[PDB]
């Protein structure tokens, strides 16, 4: 797990990593992985979260302060943020 | 331009395609391409848009109805939505 950019509590960052880790064990398709993480964060930290998972992408988004993380789990990038 | 999924007026779809076309002519890096599109849409259709541009990614997001498009321009996939 390599954190590239975060505006998020250390605690919530850990939760994002654990959540992504669980998703990658259950699923191998990016859409399913993203859905797992998005749904779990909506449930635990209220809507509205968005999640992008992939090896090759760029993004430009707007997020609430303290609710943004961009990290790698191995070679796969994960963007998770709340609008 | 191949629309893979959309919930958007035909006129706004054409604007997304045109805007993405302009972004690709100008910018080489996905993040910059995404930023151009996102910014044009905030300006023209009000905040808050988010844009992902890439060749390998999956997503799960929440969008306002009538404000979601997912399409390819050549070999590049573009996800653009308002939340």
């Amino acid at each position: 797990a390599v954190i590239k950019n975060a505006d998020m509590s250390e605690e919530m960052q850990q939760d994002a990593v654990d959540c992504a880790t669980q998703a990658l064990e259950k699923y191998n398709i990016e859409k399913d992985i993203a859905a797992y993480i998005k749904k779990e964060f909506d449930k635990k930290y209220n809507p509205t979260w968005h999640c992008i998972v992939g090896r090759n992408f760029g993004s430009y988004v707007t997020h609430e302060t303290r609710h943004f993380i961009y990290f790698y789990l191995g070679q796969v990038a994960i963007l998770l943020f709340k609008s | 331009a191949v629309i893979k999924n959309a919930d958007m007026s035909e006129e706004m779809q054409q604007d997304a395609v045109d805007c993405a076309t302009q972004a690709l002519e100008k910018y080489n890096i996905e993040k910059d391409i995404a930023a151009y599109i996102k910014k044009e849409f905030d300006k023209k259709y009000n905040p808050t848009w988010h844009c992902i541009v890439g060749r390998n990614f999956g997503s799960y997001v929440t969008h306002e109805t009538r404000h979601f498009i997912y399409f390819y321009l050549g070999q590049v996939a573009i996800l653009l939505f308002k939340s």
């Binding site: 950019n5 760029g58 993004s59 609430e64 943004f68 | 993040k31 996102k38 890439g54």
Partner: peptide, 10 residues
């Protein structure tokens, strides 16, 4: 408060 942020895979 909201912030714009960009990301790019390597």
């Amino acid at each position: 408060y909201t912030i714009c942020a960009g990301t790019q895979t390597d």
